[PDB]
Structure 1
Amino acid sequence: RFLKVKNWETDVVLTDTLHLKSTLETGCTEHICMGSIMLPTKDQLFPLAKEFLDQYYSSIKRFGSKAHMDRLEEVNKEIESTSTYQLKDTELIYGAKHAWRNASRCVGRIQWSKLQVFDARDCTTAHGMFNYICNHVKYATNKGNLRSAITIFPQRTDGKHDFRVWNSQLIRYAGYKQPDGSTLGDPANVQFTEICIQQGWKAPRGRFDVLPLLLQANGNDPELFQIPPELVLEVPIRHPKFDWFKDLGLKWYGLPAVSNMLLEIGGLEFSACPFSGWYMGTEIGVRDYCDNSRYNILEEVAKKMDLDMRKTSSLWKDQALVEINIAVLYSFQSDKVTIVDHHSATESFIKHMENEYRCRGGCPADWVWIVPPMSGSITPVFHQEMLNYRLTPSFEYQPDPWNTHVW
């Protein structure tokens, strides 16, 4: 019932008790582990609210105080009467910070308590959503000195009046399938790019076109807005040694801003809750640039490096991979845009895990996502056993809205 996790590099053993508070299900059973699968009423609401308010009042050292009992009382009355309830500002902020704290797939959580929370619960239209999102983008970007932020739109009611950002991230590059059957831009975004055109966007038809936002307020059909280009900090990618590198014409944006997740706090569901931090270099250099179904540039860089591409065993892909990732880090650093390398991020995460074991009794962590997509075993997380379990408040993945929306 009390569980041990061992680091095989250091012999450090931590004991996990926090998992015993978990409530939701993993996908795993006693007979099958689904650890590598990407996606494995009034009655229901009150225990959820109580569970949350108990943890909140506990956190401010006021558990079992009159203010605790009174708030439990007030929320209970509000639920029975209105079928839902509203979080106090203090509770919203606590809940959002804890959803990040509990995100078992996030290597960046040492930072969890420094989150700027923008309360957008007074929002009523897509133009309003656009305004709030621009302000978030500008605040978060901070001229390259990135600051973590979340913007929280109104909570779900009957489920027919959802706020949604249709974009999967606030800032991404367009994808277009061309006459010769290939893809221009980001193949990840071809479907979304066409939906944007279908709704009216005028695509400049390039390789790195910042997509428009497609915003859904109150269950209405979504509307298009172009983010002010001056608000989108992009970085040209050069290499500190290879001068030909710039000729590839690659760039990436500074602000990673996930916008398709659902924030659950105390049983309430915030279906539009765009959040942002800063990049770990491998997200761009390994995944965005080198996945075969993404920009898929390994073959081009390797040719420019004059590597023996005839046999897999020359490790040409691996050599190019490293150089591509040196370039990303160098470029962001040169342009003073916050970025973190995978060695640094993972070392922070080990320090974070130790803090969480010490101060909280554990840290839910998904090793499959935490270990970086290159150089796994030379980062300390590779050797670190992790227990994965689901705590609330949480961020949950939700279906792309186009499969859901009726026009």
Structure 2
Amino acid sequence: KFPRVKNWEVGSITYDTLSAQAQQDGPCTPRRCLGSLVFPAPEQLLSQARDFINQYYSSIKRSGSQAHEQRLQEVEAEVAATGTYQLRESELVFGAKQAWRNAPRCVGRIQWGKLQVFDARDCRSAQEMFTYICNHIKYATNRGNLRSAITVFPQRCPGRGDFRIWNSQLVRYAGYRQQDGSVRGDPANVEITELCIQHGWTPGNGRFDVLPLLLQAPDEPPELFLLPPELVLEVPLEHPTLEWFAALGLRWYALPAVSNMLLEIGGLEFPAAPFSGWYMSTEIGTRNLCDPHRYNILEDVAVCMDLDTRTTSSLWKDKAAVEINVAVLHSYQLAKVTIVDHHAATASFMKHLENEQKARGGCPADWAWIVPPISGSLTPVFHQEMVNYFLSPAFRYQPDPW
């Protein structure tokens, strides 16, 4: 049939009929589920192009119209002559919003229809690429009143290299491999930090050194660009009632801007299409600051809190982590930088699921990524069964360009 999906908080039941439209296959089989893994041609292009055009003309309630038939005929002829085609500008906007809407691991998809799409398909150099990125960062940051945005650089085409942003995000803190084997700064960024240095970047020695951008124009080594400090909004972390917390000297940046995914629309591939929204506080407070392999501050906050860290049964870890998340939310609200906490984010996502159930009969969702990393069952998505599948247009992971 169709997967029967239950919400255990309410007792309610839906069927995900949308999953039957899934194209690209996932990693699970009847023998074994791999849902927990992080990373698990004209006729095929036309089939994807056709389906996307159908999606576009459905969205504007013009299916089967003359304009619909003619755009299909047009895409066919371009593919027949060139082996590829070009999106109309309207199709690109629609495609990027659909890719977000289709992203199973994104809890912020209530917002998918409110996405500023910057068309950078006529970009020609790394320098111009940097200008686009700075305007993106300026637009999206908006002095702390964050606006979702994506900039789409030229599509992959035969006979020419890709545009690529080497950095995984537009704003990342350096992670300097200390000589012991430890890291100063963000350990997630040791590799890209070493690539920046190797490409001419004079490194700092702080824990919150903003990395430069390594931008790759087609058939070119990456070129290094320093973000103007006034462009990179940061929030000093303090706690509303733990006054020593500010002395920890913690900071995070305003703008989460993923820059290393591939955007796929109607068979066309955009290997450089950085996108940004605003943070959910648990990404900063729990993951970025408390992961053992990230900044790993949990035990130092707990010790400062004078918690009994000798036994796990005191739940000092849970107490310290809550306060770190309180500090993150308080600090962003204090600095007037958009942020959403995980209760509000997951409530909005439940509303997204209900909208998508009526709109499309389902919503691809990756439960382990939608459930926040603290307080899981205190949010409503915990009790919501979810079906994970791949729709297109899509954001996709891609090999690192080096």
TM bucket (normalised to shorter chain) is over 0.9
Counterpart of 1:72? 72
Counterpart of 2:117? 117
1:341-380 per-position Cα deviation (integer Å, ceiling 9, x unaligned): 0000001100110111012111110001000000000000
Instruction: State the shift of 1:59 in Å.
Output: 1.5
1:205-239 per-position Cα deviation (integer Å, ceiling 9, x unaligned): 21100000000011311100011111111000000
Counterparts of 1:16-95 in structure 2, within 5 Å, are: 16-95=16-95
* Unmatched tracts of structure 1, length 5 or more: 403-407
SS in 1 for 2:269: strand
Counterpart of 1:405? none
CA distance in 2 between counterparts of 1:23 and 1:83 reads 22
Moved more, 1-10 or 373-382: 1-10
Q: Does structure 1 residue 311 correspond to structure 2 residue 311?
A: yes
Counterparts of 1:178-189 in structure 2, within 5 Å, are: 178-189=178-189
1:83-136 per-position Cα deviation (integer Å, ceiling 9, x unaligned): 100000000000000000000100000000000000000001000000000000
SS in 2 for 1:23: coil
Instruction: State the shift of 1:181 in Å.
Output: 3.2
Counterpart of 2:323? 323
Q: Does structure 1 residue 143 correspond to structure 2 residue 143?
A: yes
Counterparts of 1:119-134 in structure 2, within 5 Å, are: 119-134=119-134
Q: Does structure 1 residue 350 correspond to structure 2 residue 368?
A: no
Moved more, 112-121 or 298-307: 298-307
- Structure 1 counterpart of 2:155, one-letter code: Q
CA distance in 2 between counterparts of 1:159 and 1:206 reads 42
Counterpart of 1:378? 378
- Structure 1 counterpart of 2:377, one-letter code: S
CA distance in 1 between counterparts of 2:157 and 2:124 reads 14
Moved more, 129-138 or 190-199: 190-199
CA distance in 2 between counterparts of 1:326 and 1:57 reads 45
CA distance in 2 between counterparts of 1:219 and 1:397 reads 21
CA distance in 2 between counterparts of 1:367 and 1:295 reads 25
1:273-315 per-position Cα deviation (integer Å, ceiling 9, x unaligned): 0000000000000000000100000111111111111111111
- Structure 2 counterpart of 1:312, one-letter code: T
- Structure 2 counterpart of 1:301, one-letter code: V
- Structure 2 counterpart of 1:376, one-letter code: G
CA distance in 2 between counterparts of 1:265 and 1:188 reads 30
Instruction: State the shift of 1:245 in Å.
Output: 0.2
CA distance in 2 between counterparts of 1:191 and 1:160 reads 26
* Unmatched tracts of structure 2, length 5 or more: none
Instruction: State the shift of 1:182 in Å.
Output: 2.1
Normalised to the residue count of structure 2, the TM-score between the two structures is 0.99
Counterpart of 2:15? 15
1:230-267 per-position Cα deviation (integer Å, ceiling 9, x unaligned): 11110000000111001110000000000000000000
SS in 1 for 2:243: coil
- Structure 2 counterpart of 1:15, one-letter code: Y
CA distance in 2 between counterparts of 1:308 and 1:2 reads 50
Normalised to the residue count of structure 1, the TM-score between the two structures is 0.97
1:305-333 per-position Cα deviation (integer Å, ceiling 9, x unaligned): 11111111111111100000000000000
Counterpart of 1:366? 366
Instruction: State the shift of 1:159 in Å.
Output: 6.9
Counterpart of 1:273? 273
Percent pairwise identity: 68
Work out the number of aligned pairs and report it: 402
Moved more, 59-68 or 346-355: 59-68
Q: Tell me which stretches of 4 or more aligned residues in structure 1 moved more than 3 Å.
A: none
- Structure 2 counterpart of 1:268, one-letter code: L
- Cα 1:322/1:350, change in 2 over 3 Å: same
CA distance in 2 between counterparts of 1:179 and 1:30 reads 47
CA distance in 2 between counterparts of 1:43 and 1:10 reads 46
- Structure 2 counterpart of 1:211, one-letter code: L
